[PDB]
Each structure stands twice: as structure tokens, then as C-alpha cells.
């Protein structure tokens, strides 16, 4: 951000501005479930398929 507007007497100070660059990487996430192919069809109540 800019420096505060100061008083003026004889000359102007050519101020500067800082910078605070922030670094952060990325991470990967996963969740998986192993199921039997035959079992999903081998059901009558409509369960083990929506899972």
C-alpha cells in the first residue's frame, strides 16, 4: 500500500512500496472403494449400487 500522505515543506520524497508475494503448492486427494462386479447386479433392494 502507498505511504501516508505527508506534509509538504521544501521537497517531495519519492517513496516506494513493498510486496509480500505468497507461495503455496497444490496437493492431491483421492478415495476409492473396491467392489465385486457380479455383486452390484446380484441385488434386489437397490443397494450396493448407489455406493
Amino acid at each position: 500500500q502507498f505511504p501516508k500522505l505527508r506534509e509538504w515543506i521544501g521537497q517531495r520524497v519519492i517513496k516506494d512500496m513493498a510486496a509480500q508475494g505468497y507461495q503455496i503448492t497444490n496437493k492431491l486427494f483421492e478415495s476409492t472403494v473396491g467392489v465385486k462386479r457380479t455383486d452390484i447386479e446380484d441385488d434386489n433392494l437397490g443397494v450396493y449400487g448407489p455406493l
Binding site: R37, I40, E41, G49, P50
Partner: protein, 405 residues
């Protein structure tokens, strides 16, 4: 029931079939066109033949987006249909009740918002080989209404393992899910005889697209290399690393820099960078574009353009061969699909009785071709003075002028 005879239950019409499949709505296209090679394309097509339509659908979408010529051709072809006037006609020698049913259906379609969007969504099946539009059914008292039309991506479906012509939803099960009756408007235009997977036009257009893509990318690379020549610097034994770096920077900037000085013991050789022409690339692009134009719109007006030339019969010359045939085919197929899917549920839900399926009203597109008024108006008086009794109905129908009321 429906046209196919499957039992119809009004209980399932309250909610869309895909509502209980919230997983589908959260998916994102995988963009299989990026980094595509001929082997990858062949594998994609072969896998699609076996019931894996997701990759094929995504590839077709990418192909449509990334090719300007193909996109323009397809858009022009579809807009040709979208601009045709349409009407609902009663069956052959229909009775008063049938005429009333047809009139009511016509009035309902006129006042049904989103018809143009429905036609546009259905016409996607021309390139994709099949388009599925989900229906929202609502009751405004005692009469069922299509609340809205939702176009579902072709990547949401698959092939039945026991049937290669029957589509099913992807519900995480090997066999998918059968399509709900009265819940979809499936449009499957048939350019070539075969199964649904092989029936898309983009399957024909894929290879020219890849040829054009490769040619354009190679031309862009060659244009990037063009300009300055590659120049190699040579240094003698006993040149330190700092001097090596200085020589390397000098060589790197020498092309932009007009002048430079080196010791007599060093040497710089300017070798050819890329010398040739754009002729081969452009030839390949033109070949592919001509192939696409012929496949989409015919090789009489687009690729081998019909050129200029007016006249009374110029309309017929431009249209009847190729353009009229394609227009009529597409319009008739779309009309058949609509009459099968949208008109029938309205007739069998919004009206009493069980009318026979063969007598259902059929949606008809106006394919009338503008006839030369002046020549024919010159012709009639001679014929009528001769003695021929030409019916006025034929004249009024062919000219487009309506009969007096």
C-alpha cells in the same frame, strides 16, 4: 401407451429419470482432443464401437469446437432446418374428431415456448449420431404439459451389452439403465446403415479434421522457426567457461544484432534454418476442407461451388439437386422423430379415448419450393383458353397463396 407399445405409468412422470443420478450433473468433459494421434483416434473409435460412447462424445464436442470450417458447415446445415415453417396435419382422410385433435395439437405446439431450442438440440444427432432431450412433465389442472426441454450430453449414455442399437443411462452398473418411456425425445438420423455407434457423421469427418490439425500445427511451427538462420559458434582448446558463455550469448543475440566481433581463432557458421514453402501444408488443408464440405453439404455447392448465375430456374438449379435432397431428408427425419416422441404423449394424455396409433397426426415441415410466378402466370391463360380445366387447389397450393376463406 407409447408408439412402441411399452406400458406407460403416469406416476414416474412427476420427476425426471436423471434426478436420482446427481453424480452425472457434477461431471466435467475430459477433452480427449488435446494431444490426439491417429492411434489414439483409432482406439477411441474402436472402443466407442464396443459401447464406450463417453470418449467419442467428448472427442466430437472438441472437434466441433476446435475446427472453424466444420463448425460453420454444421451451423449452416442446422440453421437451414431451423428456418423452415412447419404445420401439423391430420392423417389420411381424417374424421372430424381427428381433425379436432390435430388442430388442438397444432395450437399447443404454437404456444409451446422453446420449440426452436428443441429443434436445435435434436439436430445435434446429425453429427453425434444420437441426441437425447429430457422432458419435464407438469399438470396445469387436468392437462399434462411439457414444462421444459433439457438436452443431456451424449457422454451420459452407453450401449446395452445385449443390444448394440439400444442406448442406456450410465448408472454405475454394467448394464446401465433403460430409458424411461415418455421421458425423452431421442433423435437418431441415419446417414449410413449400421449401428448407433457408427451412425455419426463426425465419425466420417474425424480423419480430415486430424489431417488439417496436423498440417496447421506443423505450418505454425515452421513459421515460428522461419526468419533468422541457425548459426553455430566454434571455439579453440583453452577457452574458459566464462569465455564460452560470452560466445554463446553473442551467438544467441547475433541474429537480432546486425554486427559483432570475435577473435580470428573462433568461427561462426550460418546454416539453413527452414527452407521450403507453405505449399504442402496448404494443399493438405484445402484437401481436408473440401472433403469436409462434400461430406456435410454436398460436392456441388460448397466444395465444388456452383458459382454465380441468376435466372428464373436458378433457384431450382441451385436447390433441387443436392440441397433440396439434403434439406428434405433432414426435415423428414426430424418431423418423424417429433411426431413419434412429442405429439403422441400429448395426444394420449391431454385427450380422452385411445386413438389407434396408425391414425396419429403427423408433424410436417414446409418443403415447398418457390415456383416462378411470372412464367406460370403466362402459361395458364393459353391452357385455359384451350379448354383444360386445371383445379384452383393445385394453383393455390403450389404458389403458396392461400385459398379464399
Amino acid at each position: 401407451v407409447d408408439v412402441y407399445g411399452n406400458p406407460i405409468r403416469t406416476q414416474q412422470l412427476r420427476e425426471p429419470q436423471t434426478s436420482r443420478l446427481a453424480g452425472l450433473a457434477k461431471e466435467f468433459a475430459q477433452h480427449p482432443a488435446k494431444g490426439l494421434t491417429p492411434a489414439k483416434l483409432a482406439r477411441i473409435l474402436v472402443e466407442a464401437e464396443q459401447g464406450n460412447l463417453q470418449a467419442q462424445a467428448e472427442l466430437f464436442m472438441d472437434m466441433e469446437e476446435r475446427d472453424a470450417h466444420l463448425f460453420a458447415e454444421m451451423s449452416k446445415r442446422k440453421r437451414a432446418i431451423l428456418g423452415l415453417d412447419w404445420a401439423v396435419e391430420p392423417p389420411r382422410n381424417a374424421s372430424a374428431a381427428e381433425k379436432a385433435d390435430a388442430d388442438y395439437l397444432h395450437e399447443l405446439l404454437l404456444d409451446l415456448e422453446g420449440l426452436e431450442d428443441l429443434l436445435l438440440d435434436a439436430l445435434d444427432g446429425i453429427g453425434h449420431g444420437y441426441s437425447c432431450i429430457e422432458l419435464e412433465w407438469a399438470l396445469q389442472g387436468r392437462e399434462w404439459m411439457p414444462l421444459a426441454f433439457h438436452h443431456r450430453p451424449q457422454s451420459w449414455f452407453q450401449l446395452n451389452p445385449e443390444d448394440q442399437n439400444e442406448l442406456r443411462l450410465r448408472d454405475n452398473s454394467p448394464a446401465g439403465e433403460a430409458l424411461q418411456p415418455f421421458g425423452w425425445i431421442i433423435h437418431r438420423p441415419r446417414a449410413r446403415s449400421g449401428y448407433v455407434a457408427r451412425s455419426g457423421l463426425f465419425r466420417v469427418l474425424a480423419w480430415p479434421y486430424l489431417f488439417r490439425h496436423y498440417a496447421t500445427s506443423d505450418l505454425a511451427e515452421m513459421l515460428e522457426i522461419y526468419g533468422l538462420p541457425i548459426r553455430l559458434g566454434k571455439y579453440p582448446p583453452g577457452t574458459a567457461d566464462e569465455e564460452k558463455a560470452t560466445l554463446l550469448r553473442a551467438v544467441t543475440g547475433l541474429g537480432h544484432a546486425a554486427a559483432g566481433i570475435i577473435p580470428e581463432t573462433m568461427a561462426i557458421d550460418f546454416q539453413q534454418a527452414a527452407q521450403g514453402s507453405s505449399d504442402p501444408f496448404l494443399a493438405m488443408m484445402r484437401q481436408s476442407e473440401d472433403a469436409i464440405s462434400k461430406a456435410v453439404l454436398g460436392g456441388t455447392l460448397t466444395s465444388t461451388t456452383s458459382q454465380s448465375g441468376g435466372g428464373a430456374f436458378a433457384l431450382g438449379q441451385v436447390h433441387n439437386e443436392v440441397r433440396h435432397d439434403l434439406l428434405a431428408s433432414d426435415a423428414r427425419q426430424l418431423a418423424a422423430t417429433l411426431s413419434r416422441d412429442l405429439l403422441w404423449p400429448l395426444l394420449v394424455l391431454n385427450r380422452p379415448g385411445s386413438p389407434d396409433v396408425r391414425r396419429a397426426p403427423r408433424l410436417v415441415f414446409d418443403l415447398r419450393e418457390q415456383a416462378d410466378i411470372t412464367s406460370m402466370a403466362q402459361s395458364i391463360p393459353a391452357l385455359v383458353n384451350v379448354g383444360l380445366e386445371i383445379p384452383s387447389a393445385w394453383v393455390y397450393d403450389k404458389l403458396g397463396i392461400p385459398q379464399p376463406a
